[PDB]
Amino acid sequence: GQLTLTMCLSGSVSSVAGPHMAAWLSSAGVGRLHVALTPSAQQFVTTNSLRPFVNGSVLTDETVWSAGGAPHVRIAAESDAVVVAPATAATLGKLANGICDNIVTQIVMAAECPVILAPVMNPAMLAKPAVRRNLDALRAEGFVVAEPFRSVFAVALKSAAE
Amino acid sequence: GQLTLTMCLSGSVSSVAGPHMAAWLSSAGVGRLHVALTPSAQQFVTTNSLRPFVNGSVLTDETVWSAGGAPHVRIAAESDAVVVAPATAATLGKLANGICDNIVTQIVMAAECPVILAPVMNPAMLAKPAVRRNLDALRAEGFVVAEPFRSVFAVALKSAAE
Amino acid sequence: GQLTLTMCLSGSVSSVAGPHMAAWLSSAGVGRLHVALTPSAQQFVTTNSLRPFVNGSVLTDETVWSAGGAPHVRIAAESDAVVVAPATAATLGKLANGICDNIVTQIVMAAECPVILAPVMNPAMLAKPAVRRNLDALRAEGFVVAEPFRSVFAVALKSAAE
Amino acid sequence: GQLTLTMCLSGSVSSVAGPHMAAWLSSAGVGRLHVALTPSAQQFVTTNSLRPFVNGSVLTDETVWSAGGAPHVRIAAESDAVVVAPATAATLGKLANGICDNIVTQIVMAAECPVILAPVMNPAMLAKPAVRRNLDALRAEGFVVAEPFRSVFAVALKSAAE
Amino acid sequence: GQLTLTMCLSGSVSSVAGPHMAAWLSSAGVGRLHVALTPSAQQFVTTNSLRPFVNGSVLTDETVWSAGGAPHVRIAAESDAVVVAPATAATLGKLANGICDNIVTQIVMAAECPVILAPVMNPAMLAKPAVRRNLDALRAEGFVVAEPFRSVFAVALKSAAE
Amino acid sequence: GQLTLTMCLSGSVSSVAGPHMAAWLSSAGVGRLHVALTPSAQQFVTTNSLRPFVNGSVLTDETVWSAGGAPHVRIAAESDAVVVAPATAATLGKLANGICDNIVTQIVMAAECPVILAPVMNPAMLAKPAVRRNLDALRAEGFVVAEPFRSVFAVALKSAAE
Amino acid sequence: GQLTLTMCLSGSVSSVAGPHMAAWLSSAGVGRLHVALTPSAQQFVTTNSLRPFVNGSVLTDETVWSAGGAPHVRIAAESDAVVVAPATAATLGKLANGICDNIVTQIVMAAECPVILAPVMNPAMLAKPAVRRNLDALRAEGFVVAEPFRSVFAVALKSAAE
Amino acid sequence: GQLTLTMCLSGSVSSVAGPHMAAWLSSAGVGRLHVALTPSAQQFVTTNSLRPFVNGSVLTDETVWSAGGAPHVRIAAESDAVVVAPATAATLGKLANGICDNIVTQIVMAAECPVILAPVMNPAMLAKPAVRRNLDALRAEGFVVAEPFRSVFAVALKSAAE
Amino acid sequence: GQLTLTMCLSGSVSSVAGPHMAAWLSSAGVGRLHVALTPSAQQFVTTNSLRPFVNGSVLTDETVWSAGGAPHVRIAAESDAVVVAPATAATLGKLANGICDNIVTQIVMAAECPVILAPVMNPAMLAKPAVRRNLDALRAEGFVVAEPFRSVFAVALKSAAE
Amino acid sequence: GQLTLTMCLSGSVSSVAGPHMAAWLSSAGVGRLHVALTPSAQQFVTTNSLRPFVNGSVLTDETVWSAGGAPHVRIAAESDAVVVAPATAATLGKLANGICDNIVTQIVMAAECPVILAPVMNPAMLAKPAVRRNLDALRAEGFVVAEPFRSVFAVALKSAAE
Amino acid sequence: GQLTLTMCLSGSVSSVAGPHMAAWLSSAGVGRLHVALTPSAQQFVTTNSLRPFVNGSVLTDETVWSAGGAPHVRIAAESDAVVVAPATAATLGKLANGICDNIVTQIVMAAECPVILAPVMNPAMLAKPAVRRNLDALRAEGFVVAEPFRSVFAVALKSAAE
Amino acid sequence: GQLTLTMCLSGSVSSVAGPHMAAWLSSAGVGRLHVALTPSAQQFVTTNSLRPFVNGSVLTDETVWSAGGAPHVRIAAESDAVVVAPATAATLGKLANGICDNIVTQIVMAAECPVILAPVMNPAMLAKPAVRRNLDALRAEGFVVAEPFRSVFAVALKSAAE
Numbered sequence A, B, C, D, E, F, G, H, I, J, K, L: 001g002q003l004t005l006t007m008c009l010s011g012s013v014s015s016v017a018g019p020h021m022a023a024w025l026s027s028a029g030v031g032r033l034h035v036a037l038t039p040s041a042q043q044f045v046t047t048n049s050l051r052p053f054v055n056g057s058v059l060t061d062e063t064v065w066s067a068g069g070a071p072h073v074r075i076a077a078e079s080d081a082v083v084v085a086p087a088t089a090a091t092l093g094k095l096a097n098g099i100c101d102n103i104v105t106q107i108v109m110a111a112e113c114p115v116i117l118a119p120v121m122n123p124a125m126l127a128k129p130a131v132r133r134n135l136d137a138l139r140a141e142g143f144v145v146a147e148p149f150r151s152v153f154a155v156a157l158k159s160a161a162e
């Protein structure tokens, strides 16, 4: 009802569910919804597919660049929860190592609200030691790592209540 | 099992469900799946979001132009059913009046298999006389008009059996 | 005074009068004025020539695409009258057959307010049977067809009162 | 001898015969020959392949746009016959419904001379009800529909005599 | 009747009246009409909106560059009057100081016929000392400055008689 | 506190101080701050370097063109002082001669508030007669010429009080 | 029946007959047909006009570049005859002097099968000494020079039998 | 003989040896050879220099993007060994930290076969602590790190046997 | 007086004299003057530098391509003399071997009037055997080779008299 | 011998003599020669036509922009004379009014050496009052105005001696 | 005096101080100054704003790419100190993990001189565990981390003395 | 030791050995090394792969064009030997016939030092009469033709000694 939730989409084909998830959130209590995309995510989701379901901003690296300022960092501050779903190995690896080189990773690293991450990758990657350690680091950040999607957004909304 | 189905996507935001529908069809009996997009549909679905679920071709006007030939018309001939879902007012209006100016409308007008159409538009358009008459014309073509999505593909698969 | 009027411009050289008409409307009672252009209309009118006289939006297909959403359909809903003046043979033919492939035709087909159309073409086209039938269809839509420009906007403003 | 004939080419591969037909006409009595192409026709014929055989204009949508004015409509007025050969389903459908959205359809709808049309399409389209009705409409226009190419231009030249 | 008049358009929104003025002149005695545009004027008028009313040339900086030669200077020589209407502060300032950096200013400075100028600007500029002095300089050139549009073209046509 | 100040930046390397000056003004009483750039100034300052310190608009010629309207002239009207700092020889020369060919010069010539100018150039230019006369003209305009930067903005803020 | 024939097209307007010739060959015994174009030939023939009649490859310099490898040289090796028809003066001159700077000349110089060449040029070139000598050189290569088109392809098919 | 080997090339000038190495492998027992390039590697090797020696795919980020799907991940699965040679500091650092942001790093992190890495960098980097730790991490992945090129491919082929 | 002369310019820096030579010819008896440029010549001469002195056509490869037809070959036929001055080694080599791959070489090889050539190159090229033989071939063509510029055009004008 | 001379070229067709003049200067005593072009001058002279005769820099606005710094102002300081020949009305007007908006005008206004200007324009401009006054202003600058080209460079070289 | 210092600028708005800092260094003892920018830094600083104060090179990724070679690595070797100020979270994270994917990170990782880093970020990032660990890693590299700008360059100059 | 050698690379895949050969030469006595590429060679070698091994210039047609002047001809003059290795059929054919249309062929034809050529082509071309004659012509030029690569550069270095 009174919640501002920011949804982040990574370069996984699962992010085609973005518009469906945004509608699920919109067609429920969520007051403000924001969506941010990594560059790779834009090969699987278009911003025009998200805008009809998103009463906040739909942010890409190009959108934020041409607008100037740091509107994404304002949105991080204004969020009661930030969800990265799907979260690719690459995005998890960047967050785990503090390398915020796009708008999605900058939003997460600027956020002080609960952060829920939903890793998605082939299990030929999810058991690799380097990925295990990244999940360890992400969890030391205080982030919630939901291994292995409506269940994910339920946990985010609960955390956003407090 | 032994069926070749071609799915067509129109410039409605509902066509973001394309990849989910293609996976539903793929994760079932369908043997060959093809997908064709109108130019306007590409603002809502990317071809890269469809390709992982489509063991046939993913066709756009640009894809077919640069390849040369009429591969879409070969695919129409090889199809046991053609589904347009969603079908915009514009696409319904073009088919209803024999104006096949893109690959999607050319596939439908070349097809001799069952054709199932799923109109999607605001009801401020669906009760307009011109749209009613277009649906009359589409139905005189022998096309199945499913007013007002898994139910739609079920009817297509039944017709494709005979 | 309390009226929202949307003016649509077609690919006829007569649409160079757009800015003059918008000023006439603005320099009178009209409360909100919107203007939409077909792609062909943009070879005869620039958006920058309209903006100084238009306190609402000036919409083209490119403007609406990059903005995302359906702001033109919101504007159709918010309009007390929609005027297409000039209305080319091509635009009349598309409306008459329910083929809304640009923002102007989508606005008209989404509108539930009075719609006034001002055909403009060489009389070598206006007596062609196909054009006569299109005008028949447009008039069955409930649209007001003003054969053969201030008089046109007067009729629109009267209808918008009720 | 004293005749001005305008030849129109549609997006069918048969329009590669354009240059051969223009030479046949040129290498005979025809006094002025003009040629107009639809955008789709330009994937099958180049203007440079036509110009050596055409003592009038070779018109495309881009040619006419950059030149300004309506030189194609002047050419329609100056023609003693207009031939569309090949005429695609799409072009026939547009003419049949009064939607002149390119230079070829504008020339036909502006012409007051005899108009001869040569449909070309797969018979999976030519027996479709919507195409049958379009041919009915084209023939109510007074156009000569030559179902199912030198024979076509012979009929055009006879009509141009009166 | 026997007069050649060149009309120049500046980067003021008033130059949208260009096509209407050209038709007024054309729909009267004027024998040859030419039109030239500054680059800024092209954000308010298109050349395609002028060409149907202009039996001479419609000149822009790009048109003249790609054509080569100085066709605009030939047109200045062939003119019985040159009208700049509207004349922006910038164009007045350039003429007043002999800086002909575009085709419009080159036409005026090459002309030996009567030159009529119609300043248009917000009165926050027209009382500025620098603009007053520019008008002084323009008038020392022998130009007719019509402070503060059919009346303007009437004065030009009278001067062109002698 | 209650002041609207517009800062203009010219094509001098000194305009890299723009962001620092905007922060100095912002980190003080100034209520609304606007910034406008000449095209040459954009080789030394980016708009993204200014936006974080500017609670009004950051205007370039391209920004204003694509937005349509004259938002810069609205901003001139709404300003209690306009500062050009640095002011190049070229910009001083244009203002001095009433040639407002970009957004910065248009803002100054439209402004009725105090105008403070800070010339910056090599003294091989500042003693040239033509530049001396331009400063004479600028000062006859009522502009404050601060020969030969915080001191400049102090004078502007004092004048803006009345 | 069992023959692989490669047809090469040069920058002569006669190469518009390419699609007609390819259909003649296809609508006969020829088993594999390949077509290669010089860059200049592409101003007279499009690849999309050839592809429907060509069951092998349609090769241009750009096609081969982006594909990588030397697929044209594989096709030369696999050919039972190579026909250049029309063969321009420029292409004849390059072959005659061993300068294979495009895909067409590389195919001929790599071919070990019979090579049939059909010169086409104005007789103001065909009697020039330099062209006579080039034909001498081409014929010393073992190539068949058919001075001065179905007859040409008949000779090629006979040679391909042995 | 029966082995599928994938060779990866990084942005080191040493990757100009790629084509020579691919020929060495091809001119030996290797059955299927694939090559993948990082974006930086393409300033030192062209894909056209590799294709003649590579009977599998030559993959770049652009190649895979436009093709859609994950053909590189299929190739990782089908490989009996993956060699990165040369492996830059940047590529080693990305693999070491699970950041697969290009096709080369995605292939390695998806591979379940032996992975052999050949670091190449100035020793001013190879003794840096951060690089030492990356090599530690790479070796904990089970990768073979060949400090400090035919010897490297020999070790890969031995591992691929089992 | 009654002569049509075509001047050709090659990629030598000496062709900057083109405009001066065209004026010399124009400021004398020459009735029609045409100028053609090789692509390399356009790095040393612009067409806009020639047009003011040339009452015929100024032809480049791009000019002729976009115009369609063979206007250069018409100009060759209409010429009483063709001069190539300067003539580079490359252009001499192409003519000598019948390789007319640009508009300049096509004009010469189509011309039946006297042809005068003025070689210009470093003497490190003019004594090379291959260049000597090319001059032998050019002279067997009947061309006049003026080893080693007003004197050259005098010889051309004398030959053009007969 | 020991002199550094900078030659400036304006947008007059006379600047095609630039390369000839630079060679005349080079083929004499001049030690360092620099050349600068206005943007309009580049439609009549190419930089590649000047470079072979210029042992200093050949400067355009684009050259200086991409290089950064003010190399043209360094060259002004290092010059013993600066010649503008031809000097257009526009360039004279800019210098006369202190508006150095390109590299050529910046060089002149930065120069402390003798400056020689050679006006070139149609006498329909040279007797205009505004141009007369500009020449008055140029001469008050201390510049030498050579009304109405080797004679011009002789005067410059004499002044450069002192 | 005898020192070569390389200054690196990251994608923080603080890097607009780059030109001011370079002038401070230049207007002091520093003998050679170099500046390198990350791609993101170029949205806040232009190279043209730095060049006037930098007697060495101003390096970007594009500059180094087009020049070829590794001039940045030569500059790293020639430096007595390298300062990254501001250093973003992203750049710190890359250095901390040995991922030198741009010219700035390559310069630091190649440098054997003292390296001083000035982190700049919102404290919502500087207390994140992943950033703390990166600073730990940077400091294990021997780098000087100046938490939380003239003071920073003072420490760099002291270290460069030894 | 004291030798300047220029290496030329043709459009053969063998030119990928360019960087290895340049290093072999550099890692030996050669004092100055230059490298020039044909346009086709750039699909197989990048300039950035050569620059690290080349202490002279790496020249392409685009490099030389944008630089102006004839730096390649200066390099030809300064060379003690010029090697073309590999030399394609096309490049051999051009040299053999004096057609220097790119920088590589211009360097060879300008060179007065020993010239060593290493033909590389499929033997389906090397026994063609036209290629045999080209080798005859190349050898009459005094060039050394090394039929059928370190051995080639050894012969060049021996000749360069005298």
Ligand SMILES: Cc1cc2nc3c(=O)[nH]c(=O)nc-3n(C[C@H](O)[C@H](O)[C@H](O)COP(=O)(O)O)c2cc1C
Pocket (backbone or CB within 6 Å): A052, B009, B010, B011, B012, B013, B014, B038, B039, B040, B041, B087, B088, B089, B090, B091, B092, B120, B121, B122, C068, C069, C070, C100, C101, C102, C106
């Ligand atoms: C956000 C958005 C949603 C739209 N949804 C629909 C829709 O659901 N049904 C429809 O007929 N048109 C819809 N339109 C309008 C169509 O996109 C438009 O008519 C288009 O030209 C259809 O093109 P196509 O039928 O060739 O795909 C929508 C437009 C926008 C901007």
Ligand SMILES: Cc1cc2nc3c(=O)[nH]c(=O)nc-3n(C[C@H](O)[C@H](O)[C@H](O)COP(=O)(O)O)c2cc1C
Pocket (backbone or CB within 6 Å): E068, E069, E070, E100, E101, E102, E106, I052, J009, J010, J011, J012, J013, J014, J038, J039, J040, J041, J087, J088, J089, J090, J091, J092, J120, J121, J122
């Ligand atoms: C073919 C041609 C020749 C011209 N010749 C002159 C000339 O001789 N003198 C002049 O003042 N302007 C001449 N002009 C107009 C100038 O090019 C125009 O004023 C231009 O903007 C000058 O720019 P610049 O002074 O910055 O070089 C000519 C224009 C054209 C198209």
Ligand SMILES: Cc1cc2nc3c(=O)[nH]c(=O)nc-3n(C[C@H](O)[C@H](O)[C@H](O)COP(=O)(O)O)c2cc1C
Pocket (backbone or CB within 6 Å): G068, G069, G070, G100, G101, G102, G106, H052, L009, L010, L011, L012, L013, L014, L038, L039, L040, L041, L087, L088, L089, L090, L091, L092, L120, L121, L122
């Ligand atoms: C993959 C490939 C390899 C080639 N190898 C050769 C070759 O080894 N020798 C040759 O003469 N031509 C070869 N060619 C053809 C040449 O690239 C072609 O003739 C080109 O225009 C030569 O240009 P250049 O001599 O100006 O560099 C090859 C072409 C391709 C696509």
